[PDB]
Design a binder for this molecule. Sequence first.
Ligand code: VO4
Ligand code: VO4
Ligand SMILES: [Mn+2]
Ligand SMILES: [Mn+2]
Ligand SMILES: [Mn+2]
Ligand SMILES: [Mn+2]
Ligand SMILES: [Zn+2]
Ligand SMILES: [Zn+2]
Lengths: 249, 250
Amino acid sequence: SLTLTLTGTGGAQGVPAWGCECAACARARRSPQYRRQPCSGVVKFNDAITLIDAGLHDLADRWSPGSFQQFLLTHYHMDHVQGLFPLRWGVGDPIPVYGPPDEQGCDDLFKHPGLLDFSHTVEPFVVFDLQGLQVTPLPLNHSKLTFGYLLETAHSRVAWLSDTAGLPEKTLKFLRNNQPQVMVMDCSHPPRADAPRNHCDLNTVLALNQVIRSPRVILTHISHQFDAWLMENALPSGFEVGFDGMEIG
Amino acid sequence: SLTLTLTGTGGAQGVPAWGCECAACARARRSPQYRRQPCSGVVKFNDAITLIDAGLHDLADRWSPGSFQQFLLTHYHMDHVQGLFPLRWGVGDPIPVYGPPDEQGCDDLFKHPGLLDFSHTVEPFVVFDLQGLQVTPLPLNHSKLTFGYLLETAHSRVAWLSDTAGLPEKTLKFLRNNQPQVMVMDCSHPPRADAPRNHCDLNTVLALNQVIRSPRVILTHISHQFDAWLMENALPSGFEVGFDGMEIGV
Ligand code: VO4
Ligand code: VO4
Ligand SMILES: [Mn+2]
Ligand SMILES: [Mn+2]
Ligand SMILES: [Mn+2]
Ligand SMILES: [Mn+2]
Ligand SMILES: [Zn+2]
Ligand SMILES: [Zn+2]
């Protein structure tokens, strides 16, 4: 069995953005269901649990040491690893952290890892196994060394693709060739005429799925500007917006 | 009116420590008043508000841009600045951040400060004014460039001294000569046979105050091991343990 929960669907700024009173941020202050925490997920394959990224600040309250099997990191920007900082001082057995071979990490995680074991680095396009789940690292287009991941079982294929601006050629072809049934994709911005540089806008996501043809694209890493746009514009069939806590089967 | 609220009184590990079943951690789970969030304070002087350190993760819920006057930072360890990372992307006027002239900061705060203005670096023993509050930076003994602060108004004096081990000579002498009525001091550790390197134990605090002679020392940055010790052992007169939400007046 393969399930995926989106625990956070925002970017670093979040929704509401601090001090902002735009339509999306004001709504999220009034109704918590519309809040967006840092982009992160939970994957459950049978009994085995993987935490994708660690930008949430309350992991120590959601989980106890030993209650999940590993972290899987996309990259070392603060909004994807800030939740590791207090966890590392816990009491328990070592916790494997799988991720890209970023040689610097973030602040002093690598020098003072506590119970976190960052030795589990992975390689582009080289499949590795997490309790039987087949995971393929996919290089993304981002200011840090950043991997997305294909998650595969006998019957299911899900892609986790944040943070990215467009996709590198080989990654794009890989996804077209290994069509995911579900793609969770960075779409920080509303439709733009050009670019952007570090994250996709909606036009870029539409262009990418013209190639990949995933039947279910779930947008994440949503900025408050995109949320405001979504309050007044519909998405095309086959696209939906993620929300914090969304469960995917 | 000068008042100080301790919004967090723990170290990086916190109380409860993640996964720990010791008596102090179990107590904090059962009785949340005993939880200890990252070492931080809120100073209110007349109308003005200063946030001392920024390790709390819920600042955006507690405050809005412009609802306080400035941040005052002791140092750039994560447990003292992690709360700044989401806030910087906010909407509003620039927010002054006063602190030591650490050339690196933490991660990409300096490169991408957003609405935070880190240009307000301060100097050892050089007084600066925060809406009438007289503040003196005091070098501490710690693995990062770290300042504590004397806060003074109308001959009322409060020292904020975390994180530190034994105090540098000049700082110790300055405090003896400017005896604070209240000192909030790093005491991460229960009493030890040897002074620890980056944070005081109780014996070091006792030794320091035998020189400074402040009549009221409030211990903070408290580890779960020290809480466990405090559950079975009393502090000497003139020393008390801080707690999250503690209110201090002068
Ligand atoms: O810090 V980012 O979520 O714009 O790569
Ligand atoms: O991260 V510390 O509170 O031991 O300086
Ligand atoms: Mn991000
Ligand atoms: Mn990023
Ligand atoms: Mn500290
Ligand atoms: Mn420190
Ligand atoms: Zn907004
Ligand atoms: Zn404990």
